[PDB]
Amino acid sequence: QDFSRFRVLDMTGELGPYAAKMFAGLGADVIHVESPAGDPLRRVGPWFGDRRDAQASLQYLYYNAGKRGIAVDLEHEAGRTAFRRLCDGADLLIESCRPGWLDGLGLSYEVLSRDNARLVQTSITPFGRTGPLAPYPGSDLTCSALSGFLYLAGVDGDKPVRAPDNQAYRMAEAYAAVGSAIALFSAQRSGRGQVVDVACIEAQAMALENAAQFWDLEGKIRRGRGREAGSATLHPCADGFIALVAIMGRNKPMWTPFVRWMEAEGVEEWQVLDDDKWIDYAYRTSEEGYATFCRVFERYTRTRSKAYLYEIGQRFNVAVTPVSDGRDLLANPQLAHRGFWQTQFNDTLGANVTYPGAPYEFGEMQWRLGRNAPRLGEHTREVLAGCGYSASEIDNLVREGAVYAEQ
Amino acid sequence: NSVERALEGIVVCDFSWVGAGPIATSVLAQCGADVIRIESVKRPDTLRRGEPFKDGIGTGLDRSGYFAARNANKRDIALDMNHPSAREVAVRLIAKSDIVINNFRVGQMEKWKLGWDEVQKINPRAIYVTMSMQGTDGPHSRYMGYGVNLNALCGLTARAGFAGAPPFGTGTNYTDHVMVPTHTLFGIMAALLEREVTGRGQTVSLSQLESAISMTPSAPMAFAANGEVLGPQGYGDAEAAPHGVYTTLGYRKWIAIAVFDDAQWAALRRVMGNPPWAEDDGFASAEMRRRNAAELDERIEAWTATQYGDWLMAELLKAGVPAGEVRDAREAIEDEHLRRRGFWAYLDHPEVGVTLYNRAPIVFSRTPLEMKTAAPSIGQHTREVLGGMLGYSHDEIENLVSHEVLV
Numbered sequence: 001q002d003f004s005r006f007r008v009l010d011m012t013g014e015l016g017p018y019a020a021k022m023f024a025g026l027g028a029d030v031i032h033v034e035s036p037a038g039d040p041l042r043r044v045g046p047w048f049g050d051r052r053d054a055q056a057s058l059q060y061l062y063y064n065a066g067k068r069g070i071a072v073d074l075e076h077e078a079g080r081t082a083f084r085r086l087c088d089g090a091d092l093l094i095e096s097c098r099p100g101w102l103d104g105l106g107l108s109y110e111v112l113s114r115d116n117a118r119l120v121q122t123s124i125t126p127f128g129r130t131g132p133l134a135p136y137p138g139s140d141l142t143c144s145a146l147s148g149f150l151y152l153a154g155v156d157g158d159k160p161v162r163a164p165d166n167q168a169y170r171m172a173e174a175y176a177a178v179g180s181a182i183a184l185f186s187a188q189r190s191g192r193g194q195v196v197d198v199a200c201i202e203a204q205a206m207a208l209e210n211a212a213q214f215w216d217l218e219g220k221i222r223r224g225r226g227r228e229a230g231s232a233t234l235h236p237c238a239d240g241f242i243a244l245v246a247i248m249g250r251n252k253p254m255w256t257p258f259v260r261w262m263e264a265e266g267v268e269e270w271q272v273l274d275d276d277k278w279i280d281y282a283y284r285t286s287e288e289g290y291a292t293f294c295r296v297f298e299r300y301t302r303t304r305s306k307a308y309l310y311e312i313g314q315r316f317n318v319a320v321t322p323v324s325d326g327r328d329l330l331a332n333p334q335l336a337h338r339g340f341w342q343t344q345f346n347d348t349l350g351a352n353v354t355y356p357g358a359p360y361e362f363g364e365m366q367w368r369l370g371r372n373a374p375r376l377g378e379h380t381r382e383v384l385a386g387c388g389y390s391a392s393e394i395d396n397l398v399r400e401g402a403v404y405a406e407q
Numbered sequence: 408n409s410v411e412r413a414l415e416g417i418v419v420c421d422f423s424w425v426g427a428g429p430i431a432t433s434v435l436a437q438c439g440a441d442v443i444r445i446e447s448v449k450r451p452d453t454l455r456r457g458e459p460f461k462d463g464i465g466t467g468l469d470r471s472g473y474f475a476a477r478n479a480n481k482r483d484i485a486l487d488m489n490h491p492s493a494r495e496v497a498v499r500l501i502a503k504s505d506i507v508i509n510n511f512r513v514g515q516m517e518k519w520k521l522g523w524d525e526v527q528k529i530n531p532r533a534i535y536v537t538m539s540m541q542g543t544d545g546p547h548s549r550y551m552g553y554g555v556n557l558n559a560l561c562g563l564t565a566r567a568g569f570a571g572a573p574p575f576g577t578g579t580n581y582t583d584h585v586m587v588p589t590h591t592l593f594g595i596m597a598a599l600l601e602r603e604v605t606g607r608g609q610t611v612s613l614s615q616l617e618s619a620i621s622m623t624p625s626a627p628m629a630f631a632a633n634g635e636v637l638g639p640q641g642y643g644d645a646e647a648a649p650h651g652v653y654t655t656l657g658y659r660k661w662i663a664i665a666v667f668d669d670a671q672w673a674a675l676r677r678v679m680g681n682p683p684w685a686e687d688d689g690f691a692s693a694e695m696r697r698r699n700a701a702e703l704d705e706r707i708e709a710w711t712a713t714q715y716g717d718w719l720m721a722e723l724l725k726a727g728v729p730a731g732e733v734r735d736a737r738e739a740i741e742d743e744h745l746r747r748r749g750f751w752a753y754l755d756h757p758e759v760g761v762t763l764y765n766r767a768p769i770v771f772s773r774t775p776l777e778m779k780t781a782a783p784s785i786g787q788h789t790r791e792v793l794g795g796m797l798g799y800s801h802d803e804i805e806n807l808v809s810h811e812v813l814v
Contacts, residue, residue: 003597018622022593045645046629046637058628109772128770133744136724141642141650142731145663148739150652152578153567157659159652160733161575162642164566170622172768174589179769181596182438186413186774188603194773202750202768209579210459211736213472216763217459221735224578225555232555232580234564234573241574243559245552249456314550321556323564323574326630326637329620337545340617341627354631359618360594363523363609365601 002027002365006184008092009033010067013040014166015200016096016124017063018173019180023092024066024370025358031086031383032067033095035074036404038376039064048349054376055348059165061373062355065344069374070383071404074105078402085387087112087119091187092180096124099134109195120183120193124176126168128199138200143168147204148211152224160224171203229284229293230258234323237301241323242309244297252279254319261316267300330354342369380405412439413774417599420500421445421481422509424452426554427538427587427615429477432508434592434767436480437776443500443792444483448785448814461759469758469784478782479754479764484793485786485814492812494519499797501529505608506595508536513543523610534598534608536591541616554580561619562626569641582619590618648696649675652733653708655716661733662716664707664723668693674726678719679710752778786814 003026010020011033024030032039041060048056055061073079084107087093093112095102102108113119123129126138133146141162144150149168153160179196187193205212214220225232230246246258255278262270273296283289301309306322313320322328335341342357358367380403384394397403417440421432424446436442446452454474461470486493497519501507507526509516516522523535540552541560558564558576568574594611602608620627629637642663644650649672650665666672669692676685684706689699696703711719716732723730732738740763745751752764766776789808793799799807807813 002601026597043646046625046633048632058625058632062624062628127744128748130770131744131747133724137727137729138731139647139665139667139729141644141647141652141663141665142729145652145661145731145733146739146742146744148734148736149577150663151733151735153575154578159642159661160578161568161639163577163581164563164639165623165625167581167622171585171589174585174593174622175768178434178589178592178596179771181593181600182413182769183771183774185596185599185603188600190411192773194771197770197772198768199748199770202745202748203585205739205745205750205765206768207577207579207581207584208736208739209584210457210473210476212740212763212765213476214459215736215740217461217472217759218463220459221737224575225580226575226578232553234559234576236573240565241559243556243564243576245556248553249453314547317551319551319553319556321550321552321560323559324562324626325565326562326626326628329562329627330631332547334541334545334547335616335620338542338614338617340620341631354628356621356624356627357617359590359613359621361610361612361614362594362598363611364605364607365597365609 004029006091007031007089008094009086009090011093011095011097012124013096014044015126015169016094016173016176017041018170019122019124019177020094021063021066022177023180025367026365027368030067031379032064032069032374034069034071034376036071036401048351048353051349055373061346061353064373065355066368066370067374068371068379068383069377070380071377073402073404074107076400076402078397078400080105080107082384082387082389082397082403083107084112086383088116089387090116090119092120092122092184094122094124094176094180099123099125099129113193118187118191118193120180120187120196122176122180122183122196122198124172124198126200128202129195129197133201140166140168143200144204147201148208149204152208152211152222155223155227168200168204171207172198172200175203175206227285227290228281229290230255230278230297231284233293235294235298235301237309238303238305240306240325242301242306243321243323245319247278247284249281250279252276255279257317261313261318262296262300264316265300265312267296269296272296344369344372346372348372348375375406377404377406410777411774412777413771414438414440417441417506418504419443419506419508420497420504422507422511424510425454426510427583427591428508428510430584431588431591431595432481433477433479434588435506435595437767437778438774439777442481443788444478444481444783445486445488445497446483446785447487448485449487451785461762467758469756469782472762475756475762475782476764480777480779481783482788482792483783483785484789487812488519490812492807492810494521496793496797496807496813497521498529500792501526501533503796504530504533505599506534506536510538513539527608530608532602532606532608534595534602534611536595536611538587538591538613538615540614542614554583557582557615557619561616561623563619563623566623566626566637566639568639570638574639582615586619586622587613587615590621643700646693648693648700649703649707651704651707653704653711655711655714655719655732657716660716662711662719663731663733665729666696667729671728672696674728675723678722678726678728682710754778754781756781789813
């Protein structure tokens with residue numbers, strides 16, 4: 001019944017959680033496992049209003065919608081026993097623990113899969129479970145730095161800027177969901193799971209575009225796009241910025257519609273653009289070519305809004321888009337037509353929360369947001385009962401601090 | 408010598424020919440799937456003519472690392488699909504394929520009588536994958552864009568920049584590289600998992616814009632919740648302090664350092680030699696380090712500028728402080744860690760010799776990814792596939808390719 005037959009344990013924090021969310025979105029039984037200290041993602045913003053409490057992190061609410069929540073202390077012998085029982089009944093464990101931590105607690109993959117040969121265990125870490133960086137801490141910025149990705153977010157000698165929403169983490173998590181699903185598929189057929197090791201530094205090296213090949217093939221170090229006239233360039237307009245791809249390569253058929261747009265709008269000096277010199281990459285990246293392009297085009301763009309340029313540029317069959325802000329996104333009429341934004345009342349917050357919606361559509365499966373993200377230990381009791389614990393054993397575990405159940 | 412591959416026996420009919428499609432099928436090919444690219448010699452993949460080229464020599468169609476890095480391990484048959492006899496060949500292939508994926512203009516496969524309706528009858532086990540910029544119906548459904556356009560449209564670019572400055576984005580066509588291919592792959596695997604139960608394939612459809620927003624939730628969620636646009640923050644962070652990019656010795660040399668709690672701040676102070684300035688009350692708490700971030704960054708950079716970044720990175724990591732040099736592509740290629748992990752792979756090619764590729768960012772403990780063959784030339788496997796897999800007679804093959812239905 002969609003993915004309902006798959007049980008996924010999700011022991012993740014600031015790093016990790018989008019991977020189990022993807023399983024939850026197709027209906028899997030996903031259980032978010034926290035320590036009694038709480039998932040650290042609960043303590044990072046942005047925030048719902050002025051609230052700063054454990055349910056107020058918009059990221060927490062988003063990445064952990066569709067999951068139940070339990071709290072287990074794996075530093076406690078009793079907790080490790082409950083965790084082992086949970087794993088005996090799990091198809092998939094996704095976790096972002098420090099390399100070596102679970103092994104050091106006697107919870108290696110071999111232990112976790114002893115009575116569950118099909119178990120898949122996916123580890124999401126900054127650098128991997130192994131190798132010379134595995135002992136050492138990493139964060140979104142420092143993974144981005146070490147992977148090569150961060151360096152590309154600038155030109156010349158300028159310091160680079162960060163991508164938003166911890167893309168080191170998100171890239172690893174997306175590939176970890178893919179690796180998890182591939183190993184799960186393989187386990188369906190072989191009866192044997194395995195370990196799936198996804199490192200942020202490797203996942204981000206997937207996003208170097210062609211920088212690694214520029215070095216291997218030509219001995220060239222590249223940085224970011226943005227200074228090739230009319231080709232992946234950003235331009236100021238009346239109320240923000242737009243992104244333009246009027247030409248790539250020697251593709252004059254891309255450029256001619258752009259010249260027609262400029263002519264039709266009566267842009268001053270549009271004839272400067274009506275010249276085959278713009279078909280040459282070397283001219284487009286020259287200081288005079290880039291400066292002249294910006295001079296002509298931005299005299300026009302500065303007088304017009306994002307929405308106007310999007311409408312009119314696309315009317316002329318040119319690849320122009322707005323540099324959308326959050327208000328633009330919520331107002332986007334295509335996303336409105338598609339029903340993308342999902343709003344779900346949150347009882348803990350006493351308010352509606354709006355979330356991104358489905359990243360894909362299926363002929364037979366249904367994507368869904370799922371339940372509001374759990375409170376700390378919200379489902380500890382009902383999940384342990386599901387694994388065969390009675391009340392008294394569970395009350396033992398709470399009183400000894402091996403698990404935490406909410407009020 | 409028994410090698411286990413997670414997607415053994417899976418066959419992919421791959422019409423995709425630029426953008427995210429080929430990146431997704433590259434991963435399938437590393438898992439043991441037989442990915443057969445359909446590529447017409449009249450309509451070659453445009454990346455074949457894109458730099459970088461071996462030694463900067465862009466002759467022919469088999470020298471581009473832009474093309475090559477996305478196409479290892481694939482087979483390639485040259486079919487002219489607007490020739491009538493070519494359809495019958497594709498039909499035989501679809502009859503043997505688990506996955507059909509394409510990028511043709513909306514309605515083209517339907518014009519060839521190769522839409523889902525017809526594919527489901529050719530092979531009810533086939534999974535039929537398509538994608539669009541932002542959906543195939545709705546007010547913006549005919550709009551055009553590339554990865555850089557989607558970075559802008561999805562909200563990423565506006566939040567990738569220094570405060571008060573023009574935004575930058577990632578410097579790349581980022582949405583193409585990880586966001587879209589990982590969601591495509593997860594959808595494919597979900598359909599494959601469901602098919603183990605139902606025995607039926609189904610359609611998988613992706614809006615690239617919606618896949619991108621799904622990994623960049625903060626911009627729209629913060630505006631929806633709070634009615635205020637969430638601005639970009641350069642290379643800072645909302646919680647960590649200090650958190651930034653700092654000069655070290657050498658050309659365009661920077662180190663990323665990110666401190667998340669008082670213990671890591673004490674460690675950074677220790678590595679700095681415990682200078683009295685860092686003992687000021689103005690830096691004693693995360694909250695004060697955030698408040699005084701500008702001064703803090705100036706003082707940190709005055710010290711890092713006197714240091715070798717590799718030595719400083721190592722000392723900080725060994726003190727438990729997240730740190731990483733801001734690496735260029737050469738440094739990533741030469742990294743001890745990525746090389747010990749086996750991320751980089753060199754493959755021999757009949758025209759360009761041994762050149763650099765990489766596996767996808769997944770280390771499977773039992774069914775590891777494989778890197779076997781360099782990117783194919785157009786039609787490299789035409790005769791092999793037609794004769795060995797699709798059952799055409801030697802005579803029929805030479806008839807199909809003498810009449811130049813296939814090359």
